[PDB]
Ligand binder design. Structure first.
Ligand code: FES
Ligand SMILES: [Zn+2]
Length: 396
C-alpha cells in the first residue's frame, strides 16, 4: 500500500506584513481553489487541526483506502508566520488525531507516532519564500517536517503574485538554499498566466528554474491561473486589467513545461517526470550542482525507463544542522528515499550506495536523514539512530 495524503488547512491569519492597504486575511493559494474538498472540509471544521485530520481519516477509511502510511499536509502558506503556541498546538493536534491518544507534548505525540497504526511518514508545510529563515526551518524540524512547498508562483520580480505583498527572486534562492542545507525536500508552486506575464515568459522562466543552480526544485506544483469568481483576479478581468490564456494556449504551455523537466523532478497538476514513471531495474546516477553544494539523484530504472525507486543525496556546502561531536563536522544529507510497491530492498540498495558514495567519493563522516516520525523505525532497522530530529549513522 502507498502513502495517503491528509491535507488540512490552518486558520485565516492576518497578513504577515504591516500594510493599511493589505487585505483582512492573508492570501492563500487555496483562495483560487475554493471548491476543493479539503478547503470546504476545513471551513466546515472551523479550521481545527484535530477535527480535520480525524474527519479525513474517516473519509479515507470509508473509501476503503489504507491509512497505515500517511503524509500530513499543512496548507495556507502563512502558518509559520502565526503565533508559536498556535503552530506547536496545531501540529500536536494533528499527531494526536493520528495516534488516537492525546499526549503531554509534541515530542510525546511524535514518539507515540513512531509505532502508531497511522504512521506519519511525511509532513509537508506550505510557506511563502519570505517566511522561511533559519528559525522557521528549525521549527519545521521540531514539527517533523520532511517536505516544504514554496509559494514561488513565478520567478520574476515584475510579475504579480496571487498573494499580497509578493516576494523577490532572491528570497526564493535563499530559502531554497537553506531548505536544502537542512536536508528537506523542496517543491515550487508554479502559476503560469499570472498578471504581467506571457506564455513565452512563463516558458523561459520554466526553463530557467531547471538550469540555474540557485533553484532546481525537486518538484513543481502547477496551478493554472484562471479567473475565479469572488477574487481580485475577477475584478481585474472586469476592468480589463487581466485576460487569461485560452485553453489551447495554457494546455500548450503546460505541455511544453512538462517537456523540459529534468529526470529528478516531479510534476503535479492541481511527460518524463518522476510521477509519470511510477510503474530487471538497474541503478542510475545523476549529479547536478545546487545552492553551492552537490545533488546526487540515484534511481532504479529498467530498459523501458520506468522508475522503481529514488534517493536524493546532498553533499552540502556547509553543516548547518547540529548533531554533536559523534557525527563529525562534515555530514551528507539524504533528502529523500522513495520506493514503489514491492521492492523494499531497493531502498536498502539505494541507501547502501548513498553511504558508500558519501564515505568513499566525498569522504564524509556520517549520513543524516530527515525522516518522518512514522518512518524512523525503518532507518533504525538499518543502523541509524535519532539525533536532533535526524536519523544518523557513522560511515565505516
Ligand atoms: S496591499 Fe499591502 S503590500 Fe500591496
Ligand atoms: Zn508528470
Amino acid at each position: 500500500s502507498g502513502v495517503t495524503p491528509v491535507a488540512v488547512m490552518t486558520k485565516p491569519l492576518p497578513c504577515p506584513g504591516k500594510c493599511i492597504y493589505c487585505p483582512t486575511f492573508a492570501a492563500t493559494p487555496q483562495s483560487y481553489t475554493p471548491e476543493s474538498p479539503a478547503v470546504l472540509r476545513a471551513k466546515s471544521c472551523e479550521y481545527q487541526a484535530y477535527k480535520q485530520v480525524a474527519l479525513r481519516l474517516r473519509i479515507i477509511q470509508d473509501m476503503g483506502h489504507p491509512t497505515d502510511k500517511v503524509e500530513l499536509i499543512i496548507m495556507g502558506g502563512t502558518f509559520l508566520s502565526a503565533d508559536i503556541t498556535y503552530q506547536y498546538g496545531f501540529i500536536k493536534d494533528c499527531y494526536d488525531a493520528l495516534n488516537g491518544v492525546v499526549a503531554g507534548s509534541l515530542e510525546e505525540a511524535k514518539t507515540i507516532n513512531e509505532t502508531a497504526q497511522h504512521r506519519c511518514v511525511g509532513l509537508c508545510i506550505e510557506t511563502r519564500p519570505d517566511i522561511c529563515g533559519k528559525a522557521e526551518i528549525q521549527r519545521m524540524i521540531d514539527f517533523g517536517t520532511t517536505r516544504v512547498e514554496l509559494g514561488v508562483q513565478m520567478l520574476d520580480d515584475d510579475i504579480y503574485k496571487l498573494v499580497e505583498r509578493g516576494h523577490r527572486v532572491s528570497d526564493v534562492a535563499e530559502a531554497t538554499c537553506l531548505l536544502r542545507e537542512y536536508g528537506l525536500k523542496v517543491h515550487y508552486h508554479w502559476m503560469p498566466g499570472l498578471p504581467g506575464s506571457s506564455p513565452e515568459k512563463d516558458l523561459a522562466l520554466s526553463r530557467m528554474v531547471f538550469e540555474d543552480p540557485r533553484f532546481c526544485p525537486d518538484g513543481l506544483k502547477l496551478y493554472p491561473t484562471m479567473v475565479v469568481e469572488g477574487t481580485i483576479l475577477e475584478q481585474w478581468w472586469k476592468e480589463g486589467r487581466y485576460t487569461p490564456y485560452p485553453n489551447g494556449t495554457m494546455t500548450g504551455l503546460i505541455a511544453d513545461i512538462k517537456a523540459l523537466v529534468p529526470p529528478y523532478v516531479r510534476i503535479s497538476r492541481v511527460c518524463r517526470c518522476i510521477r509519470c514513471r511510477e510503474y530487471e531495474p538497474t541503478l542510475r546516477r545523476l549529479d547536478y550542482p545546487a545552492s553551492g553544494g552537490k545533488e546526487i539523484f540515484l534511481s532504479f530504472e529498467d530498459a523501458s525507463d520506468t522508475l522503481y525507486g529514488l534517493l536524493r543525496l546532498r553533499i552540502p556546502c556547509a553543516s548547518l544542522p547540529v548533531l554533536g561531536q559523534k557525527y563529525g563536522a562534515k555530514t551528507g544529507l539524504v533528502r529523500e528515499l522513495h520506493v514503489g510497491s514491492g521492492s523494499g530492498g531497493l531502498g536498502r540498495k539505494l541507501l547502501a550506495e548513498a553511504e558508500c558514495l558519501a564515505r568513499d567519493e566525498f569522504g564524509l563522516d556520517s549520513l543524516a536523514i530527515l525522516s518522518g516520525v512514522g518512518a524512523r523505525e525503518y532507518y533504525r532497522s538499518l543502523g541509524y539512530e535519532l539525533v536532533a530530529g535526524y536519523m544518523c549513522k557513522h560511515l565505516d
